[PDB]
From a paper:
The operon spr0693-[name]-[name] of [name] R6 encodes a putative [name] transporter that contributes to the resistance of antibiotics and antimicrobial peptides. Sequence analyses suggest that the Spr0693–0694–0695 assembly is similar to Escherichia coli [name], with Spr0693 and [name]–0695 corresponding to MacA and MacB, respectively. In summary, the structure of [name]-[name] reveals some features for this family of [name] transporters, which are characterized by a unique 8-TM fold and an ECD/PLD insertion between TM1 and TM2.
The crystal structure of [name]–0695 was determined at 3.3 Å resolution. In contrast, the TMDs buried in the membrane pack against each other tightly via hydrophobic interactions with a buried interface of ~1800 Å2, leaving no opening to the intracellular face of the membrane. The two NBD subunits are somewhat separated, leaving the ATP-binding pocket exposed to the solvent. Thus, we propose that the helix α6 functions as a guard at the entrance of substrate tunnel, thus terming it the guard helix.
Residue numbers in the entry:
A (entry chain B): 2 to 227
B (entry chain M): 2 to 65, 91 to 416
C (entry chain S): 1 to 61, 91 to 263, 273 to 416
D (entry chain A): 2 to 14, 20 to 227
Write the structure that this text describes.
C-alpha cells in the first residue's frame, strides 16, 4: 500500500550568488488509494514538491522512496522509464498536442512505454471510455471543449496504469459547472483505488480529496494524519 | 520510434517543409548539373587517354639535335608486336578561304603511312597519294566539320584552293574519324592534314617532330617502347643523346586537371546555393524547437529521453535534406540528359551525368548538409528542461 | 512610418532568427556583387584602354608607302609624335619550349620612345640594328619568363620566331603588355621593321600612327592627316567593344549561378515570414481589434521582409567590397595593374535587387496575414 | 444617454445564431450577459465590437449606424469606441506593459511623446506601480489583466467589452479585478461583460440571459 515516502527533502535553487532555499525538511508519506490535496501560498513550492514527486526535479538533499526503492539520483534514461510507468501528469491547461487527435494524444505515453500498435489503439479506446468521452476520439483538441480536453488529458494520464496521478489545479481552466463534472471523475477514479495528489489554490476543490495538506514557506505545516 | 515522430512532424507543416526542401532541391541540382558536365567532359578525354596507349611516342632526349631519317623508323617498326608507324610535323594555321576563316586549326604533316596508320575515313575526294610526296605538292585534306564550315559541304570542298598561312593549298579530300568529331573540346577550329614535306618546305620547320609506333596489344608497351627507343639509337648512330619514350599521360593529365579546376570553381559557386539552403534548413529547425518547447517538455514528462529527442530532431532534418538531395539529384539528372541531347551540335560523345560517383557524392553531401546544419537545433531541443518548458 | 518601427520590433523579437534569415541574403548578395564587380572591373579596364586608342590616330588607305611623309606630316601643330609598324603573329620556339601566336611588332626608329617600351633586361633597339640589317628582338616580361624562366636568362640567346633566328637583345614591360594577357595575345615581341620586311616578305611599313596627346583635337586634325598622306600617292577605333561584349556575357553567366544562392535566400525569408504569420495569428487579430485594417497588416508584414532582405543586401554589399579589394590583390599576379572594385551602379543595382527580393517573396505571407479573420484569431 | 441600440439583429451562417436581437444600453450601465452554450453569447459580443457584421438588422453605436460600414471605417470606429478585454489577456509578449498599453493609441494618430503620458496615466488608474517596463513574462495574472484593462481604457472608449475577465485568474485575484471594473463603472465607463459564473455576474447592475439567438431574461425588464 505504501507509495510516496519523502524524507528530509531540501531543494535549494542556486542563481549566481543566491542559494535560494525553497523546500526544507519535507517529511511526508502517501499510501495507495489516497486522495491528498496540497494547498498553500505562492513561493511555498507546491510546484517544487510536485515535480520532486513526479521525478521532473531531483532534491538537493534528503530521500524519496517510490514503492520503497530510492529514486532521487537515478540516471535520466532510467528515471524517465520510472516516470512513464508510475506518474500520470494532469495539467491545469490541458497540454494536448494540437496536431494529434484525442486518440493518438492518449496513445503517446504507450509509445514511450513500448507498446505494440495493435494494443495502443485499444488501450487508448478503453481509457477514453473510462473517462466518459462522447465527442469522437478522432478529433483534434481544436474541436474539443474544455472538459473534453481535460478528459483526454486524464485518459493519457491513466493509459500506462500509473501509481500516482499528480494533478495541478485541473478545474483551473474550467467553469464551476463542468469543473465539478471533472472533479467527480477524479473522485470516481480514486474510488477505484487510483492514488491522486492535487495542488489547488481553491478551498472548494481541495474539499473533494480525502486528506488536506498545507505548505508555508517550503515546510509541510498541517496534515490530517497526526 | 524516432523515425515515425520525424515523419509526423514533417507532415504536420507540409508547406513549411516543402519550401525548406526546395532550397535543398535547387542547390543540389545546381551542383550536380555543373558537376555532371565537368565529369562528362573529363570522361570523354579519358577515352582518348586510353586510345593513346596503343601509341608509343619516341623523342630525342639530349642527355641519357641530329636530323632523323624516316627509314630508321620503318626499320625500328619491324620489331614484332608493332602493327604500324608514322611520323608527323605540326604547326598552327589561320586558314582563309574567300571570305571565310578559321584562325586556329592544327595543321598536321603526314608521311604516307600516317593516314592509314591512324585509320582516317575518306568521305569526299582522295587521301594523300605517293605522287603528292614526290611532287612536293601543297595539297590539303580537311576534317568533316572544317569542310562544312569553310565550304558548306565535304563534297563542295573538293578541289578548292584554301590559303593556309598565305600559302595556297588544293583540297584533295575530306576525312572524318571519332577523334576529329570530338576535338572541339581541345580548343581547335580544325584538323587539316597535309604532307610533312610541304609543312617542312613552306614553313621553315624540319620534317619529323613526333615519331610514333602503334602496338595494338597494349600489354607489350612497357617492353616494346624502350626497345623501339634503343633500336632507334642503334640505327641513328650513337650521336650522344639517346632516344627515349615520351610519357603520354603527363600532357593529357595536364589538360584533365585544368578542366577539373574550372569545374570546381563553378561547382563551388553553385554550392553557395546549397550552403544558403543549409542555413535555411537549420533556421526552420530552430523555429520548430521554440514552436515545440512545451511539446518536448510534455514528451519528457511522458518518458522521452534527451537521447530520443536528439536523434528525433536529427532524423527530421536528414529526411528533409536527403529527400531534397534526391528530388534534386533527379531533376539534375534530367536537365543534364536534355543538355546532352542538345550538345550533339558540337560533340558526338556520351554526356548524361549519371556518374555513379557524382550521384553517390550528391547523396553523401545531401546527408552531411542535414547532419551539419541539423545538430545545433536537435541539441537545443534535447537539452530543454521539462519544468521550465511546462 | 509606424510600419518601420513595427518591422524593427519584430526583427528584434527573434534576433538570432532574423540574423540567420539575413545570412542567406548576405551570402547571396556578397557572391553576386563580387562576380558582377570583377566582370565590371575587366570591362572598365578594357574601357580605359579605348581612351588610349584615341591618342593613337591610325591612317590607312595597296601602294608602297614611305616613312619620309609620316615624318613630314608629324610637324603639324597638334601631332605629338609618330611611328610606323609591321605585323605578324608568328610562333616563338626555343629548343622544345614553344609560345603560340605572339604579336610580333616591327617598329621603326621612333617606335620605342613614341609607345614607351620600358626595358628591364639589357638594351632596347639601337640604330646600328636598323643600319646593319640585324635580326634582333625584344620580348615582353611574361613572354620572357614563359620562354626562358627568368628575364636576364632570356637575354643574349637565340629565339626561333617563325623559324628565323633572332638574338634576344632585351626584355621589356609596360602596363599595356601586362594586360595583353586578356586580349588573347600570346606575347608582344618588338623588332626592326627592316628585318620583318626582309625575313617575311611583308612591306616595310603597314600601319601609320599619329600620336596626338590632346584628346579634344582628334576631330579635324585626324581627317587632315588622312588627306595630307593622300596628296603624295593619288579612321575610328577597331573591335574594342567586342571583348567588352564577350566579358559582360561571361560575367552574366557566372553571376547568375551565384544568383541562385540569392534565390534560395529569398525562399528562405518567405518560409520564415510564413511561420511568422501563423505563429502570430493571435497578435494579428489583437491588432485588428485595436483598429488595424486589412491594408495596415499587409504593408506591415511586407515592410518587415523588405527591411530584412534590404539590410542583408546592404550588409552583403559592404562585405562584397572588402572581398572585392583583396580580389584586386589576388589579380596583381594574373592580370595586374587593374583597379578592381564595386562601382556605384553595381552597388545600388544590388540594393534594388535585394529590396526587390524582399518584396517578391514577402507579398505572399503579408497577404495571408492581411486576410486573417480577427474572430478566429482571438 | 444611449450608447448601444441593437434592433432586429439577425446572424446566420446553414446555421442561425442570432434571431431578432433587440437590446438598448445606456452610458454608465454595467450589463452582465449569461446563457447556455451556442446561444450567440459571443456572436452578440463580436457584433457589438464590430468584429462581426449582422446578416440583417441595425446597430447604433453612440447614435452612429455601424452595421454594414466598410472595413477601413469600422476599424476606426472600433478603435475610438470599443475597449476589448479578454479572459486570456492577449498581451504581446515582446512589448512591455507601457508599450502594450500604448498600442491602441498608435492605431489612433497620436503623438509618440503623448502616448507615453496617456499610458502611464492608465497604468495608474488600474493600480499598477513600478512595472511600467516589465514584460508580461515578468508579471502575475492579475498584473497582466490589469495591463490589458489599461489598454482597453486608454482611448476613452464608450464600451468595455469583457469576456470572462477572471477565468485565467484564481478566485481571490478575480474578486480584486472584478472590484477594479466596478470602480471604473462607478467613474462612468459602460461595461458589457460575458460570464459563465453567477459569482462574477453578481457584480453587474443589469442581467441579460440569451437562449438560442434571442434575449429571454433582462433584470431591467
Ligand atoms: Mg508554488
Ligand atoms: Mg455562445
Amino acid at each position: 500500500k505504501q507509495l510516496i515516502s519523502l524524507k528530509n527533502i531540501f531543494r535549494s535553487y542556486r542563481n549566481g550568488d543566491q542559494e535560494l532555499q525553497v523546500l526544507k525538511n519535507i517529511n511526508l508519506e502517501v499510501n495507495e488509494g489516497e486522495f491528498v490535496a496540497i494547498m498553500g501560498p505562492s513561493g511555498s513550492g507546491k510546484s517544487t514538491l510536485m515535480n520532486t514527486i513526479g521525478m521532473l526535479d531531483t532534491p538537493t538533499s534528503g530521500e524519496y522512496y517510490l514503492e520503497g526503492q530510492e529514486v532521487a539520483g537515478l540516471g535520466e534514461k532510467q528515471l524517465a522509464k520510472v516516470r512513464n510507468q508510475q506518474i500520470g501528469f494532469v495539467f491545469q491547461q490541458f497540454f494536448l498536442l494540437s496536431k494529434l487527435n484525442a486518440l493518438q494524444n492518449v496513445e503517446l505515453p504507450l509509445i514511450y512505454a513500448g507498446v505494440s500498435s495493435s494494443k495502443r489503439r485499444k488501450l487508448a479506446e478503453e481509457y477514453l471510455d473510462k473517462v466518459e468521452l462522447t465527442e469522437r476520439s478522432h478529433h483534434l483538441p481544436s474541436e474539443l471543449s474544455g472538459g473534453q480536453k481535460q478528459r483526454v488529458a486524464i485518459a493519457r494520464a491513466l493509459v500506462n496504469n500509473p501509481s500516482i496521478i499528480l494533478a495541478d489545479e485541473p478545474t483551473g481552466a474550467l467553469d464551476t459547472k463542468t469543473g465539478n463534472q471533472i472533479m467527480q471523475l477524479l473522485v470516481d477514479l480514486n474510488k477505484e483505488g487510483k492514488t491522486i495528489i492535487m495542488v489547488t489554490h481553491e478551498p472548494e476543490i481541495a474539499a473533494y480529496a480525502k486528506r488536506q495538506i498545507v505548505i508555508r514557506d517550503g515546510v509541510i505545516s498541517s496534515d490530517s494524519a497526526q | 520510434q524516432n523515425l515515425k515522430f520525424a515523419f509526423s512532424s514533417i507532415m504536420a507543416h507540409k508547406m513549411r517543409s516543402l519550401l525548406t526542401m526546395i532550397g535543398i532541391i535547387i542547390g543540389v541540382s545546381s551542383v550536380v548539373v555543373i558537376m555532371a558536365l565537368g565529369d562528362s567532359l573529363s570522361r570523354q578525354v579519358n577515352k582518348d587517354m586510353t586510345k593513346s596507349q596503343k601509341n608509343i611516342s619516341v623523342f630525342f632526349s639530349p642527355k641519357k639535335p641530329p636530323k632523323p631519317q624516316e627509314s630508321w623508323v620503318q626499320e625500328a617498326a619491324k620489331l614484332k608486336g608493332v602493327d604500324s608507324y608514322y611520323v608527323t610535323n605540326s604547326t598552327n594555321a589561320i586558314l582563309t578561304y574567300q571570305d571565310k576563316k578559321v584562325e586556329n586549326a592544327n595543321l598536321t604533316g603526314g608521311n604516307r603511312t600516317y593516314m592509314d596508320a591512324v585509320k582516317n575515313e575518306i568521305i569526299a575526294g582522295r587521301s594523300l597519294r605517293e605522287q603528292d610526296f614526290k611532287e612536293f605538292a601543297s595539297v590539303i585534306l580537311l576534317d568533316e566539320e572544317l569542310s562544312i564550315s569553310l565550304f558548306e559541304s565535304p563534297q563542295e570542298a573538293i578541289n578548292k584552293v584554301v590559303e593556309v598561312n598565305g600559302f595556297s593549298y588544293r583540297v584533295i579530300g575530306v576525312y572524318t574519324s571519332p577523334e576529329a568529331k570530338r576535338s572541339k573540346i581541345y580548343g581547335f577550329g580544325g584538323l587539316p592534314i597535309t604532307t610533312n614535306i610541304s609543312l617542312a618546305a613552306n614553313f621553315n620547320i624540319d620534317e619529323i617532330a613526333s615519331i610514333v609506333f602503334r602496338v595494338n596489344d597494349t600489354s607489350l608497351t612497357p617492353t616494346l617502347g624502350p626497345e623501339l627507343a634503343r633500336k632507334m639509337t642503334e640505327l641513328a648512330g650513337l650521336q650522344q643523346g639517346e632516344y627515349q619514350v615520351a610519357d603520354e599521360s603527363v600532357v593529357f593529365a595536364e589538360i584533365q586537371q585544368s578542366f577539373s579546376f574550372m569545374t570546381t570553381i563553378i561547382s563551388s559557386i553553385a554550392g553557395i546555393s546549397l550552403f544558403v539552403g543549409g542555413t535555411g534548413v537549420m533556421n526552420i529547425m530552430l523555429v520548430s524547437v521554440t514552436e515545440r518547447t512545451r511539446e518536448i517538455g510534455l514528451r519528457k514528462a511522458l518518458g522521452a529521453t534527451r537521447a530520443n529527442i536528439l536523434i528525433q530532431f536529427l532524423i527530421e532534418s536528414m529526411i528533409l535534406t536527403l529527400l531534397g538531395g534526391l528530388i534534386g539529384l533527379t531533376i539534375a539528372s534530367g536537365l543534364t540528359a536534355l543538355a546532352g541531347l542538345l550538345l550533339q551540335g558540337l560533340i558526338e560523345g556520351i554526356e548524361v551525368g549519371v556518374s555513379i560517383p557524382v550521384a553517390l557524392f550528391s547523396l553523401a553531401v545531401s546527408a552531411s548538409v542535414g547532419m551539419i546544419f541539423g545538430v545545433l537545433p536537435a541539441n537545443k531541443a534535447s537539452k530543454l528542461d521539462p519544468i521550465e518548458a511546462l
